[PDB]
Swiss-Prot record, chains A, B, C, D, E, F, G, H, I, J, K, L:
Record-annotated site: Susceptible to oxidation: 21
Lineage: Eukaryota, Metazoa, Chordata, Craniata, Vertebrata
Site residues by UniProt (Cleavage): 2-3, 5-6
Originating species: Homo sapiens (Human)
Parent-protein residues present: 686 to 706 of 770
Site positions for Implicated in free radical propagation: 19
Identification of the protein by name: P3(40)
Length: 21, 21, 21, 21, 21, 21, 21, 21, 21, 21, 21, 21
């Protein structure tokens, strides 16, 4: 987002947490 | 807040640094 | 828990994530 | 799964390693 | 790739940063 | 403490590991 | 910024990612 | 173990915390 | 300092937080 | 290797994952 | 470097470790 | 060391960095 954040992916139902720029 | 943020908690003695969602 | 884990604290309403042994 | 776990995702090409809640 | 790198995903999209072994 | 250390909390309880500046 | 963000540095150069409070 | 856990090593010694898959 | 410590760097504008060995 | 890389160590029993400089 | 790496800054004498893209 | 630190293992010649309690 620059910064990086650990964010829950809204894009599916497996509890995925990813990095976001 | 989702994403996780590294923030200072509100508690004076031994100021903590907690992950806030 | 040994291992360390980042876990949501069930102990209050500020979205706190902490380490757990 | 809460806690966050560093796990391999299920997707053969460029095997990912995702945080699972 | 063994080592686990923290790299952004393929597609030139998403803006997601994942573990890449 | 400046630096942010990752230490377990006071009380000899909780088992929680937090950021300690 | 309090929270500590992981962001890249000013100058549009370096390519360095630091803690930004 | 797949997931990579951060746990202390066997031997009840060292005091070392490593990645354990 | 070896170990890595998360510390504030000495530089007033946009106070950095750097790893110090 | 400097930078730090998250890699599998060479040691079959309880395959470790160590930081390599 | 894309990926992020923790690398020793060659650019000065304070043991600085930073992120690199 | 309580706290956790990423420290260079003095115990061998492969550039190993581990966690220390």
């Amino acid at each position: 987002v620059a910064c990086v954040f650990a964010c829950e992916d809204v894009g599916s139902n497996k509890g995925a947490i990813i990095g976001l720029a």
